[PDB]
Amino acid sequence: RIDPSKLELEERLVTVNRVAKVVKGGRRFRFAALVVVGDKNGHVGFGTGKAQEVPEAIRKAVEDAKKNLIEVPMVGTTIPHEIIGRFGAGNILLKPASEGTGVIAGGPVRAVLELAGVADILSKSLGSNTPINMIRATLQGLSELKRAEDVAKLRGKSVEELLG
RNA sequence: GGAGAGUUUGAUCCUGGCUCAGGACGAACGCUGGCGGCGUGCCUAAUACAUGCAAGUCGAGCGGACAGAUGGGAGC
């Protein structure tokens, strides 16, 4: 479901772009921030915010990021299975890793996976490197993940009839 | 066992090349320089080389030699 946002959230930002609109007078600027928000227990989200200022943009981005939250399975502090998330010419593979590796990821992917609470990720972006579409690609790859308990419940099966 | 970033625009998303962050040398150059261990050290002209050595040995295969004096005598 929609994750109700009443938690403690850490809310760090990826980028603020300076973003123009041409009028009869000339260029009129705004600041478009996108901020990733989530506790490190499995709830992530991100949001965009636009204003004339930097801090109001970060305000609106943190609000819209708290609105849309997603869940991620944290099976053994990793992800359950390797997946490619592909939101619109941003394609990012995610492998589970062993317990020592640390989050191996680039900047906004690293922000999603650190604010997810997932600790051991092999990952790589195989597409364009805008932060917005890469964050959408990561959360596409984390929405399509599957729990072994839930897939065992899906196949009319038991967990040990899957895991061995 | 797998990290990306800058740059086409007034602003943006893609495509797209270019550029960077890494590890390596039989490396060289520049600045600098303490030792020890272990390794390596003409990549070029298979260009030309003074000098010194780098393949000799067996007298239990052989003939002749050179010394040598165990005793033997020789001239003062």
HEC profile for A28-39?
EEEEEEEEEECC
Q: Is A125 within 7 A of strand B by CB distance?
A: yes
Nucleic strand B contact set for A 14-33 (CB, < 7 Å): 17-22, 27
C-alpha span between A8 and A43 (Å, rounded): 11
Q: Quickly tell me which residue has 């801090």 as its tokens.
A: A55
**Is any atom of strand B within 7 angstroms of residue A158's beta carbon?**
no
> How far apart, in whole angstroms, are the C-alpha atoms of residue A131 and residue A75?
26
Q: How many CA atoms lie within 13 A of A164 on its CB side?
A: 1
In whole angstroms, B29 C1' to A125 CA is 40
- Scanning every strand, the nucleotide with its C1' closest to A30's CA turns out to be B11
User: Can you give the C-alpha Rg of chain A in angstroms?
Assistant: 18
Q: How was this structure determined?
A: cryo-EM
Pair A93, A82: CB distance under 8 Å: yes
* A83 closest CA partner among A73, A74, A93, A91: A93
Resolution (A): 3.1
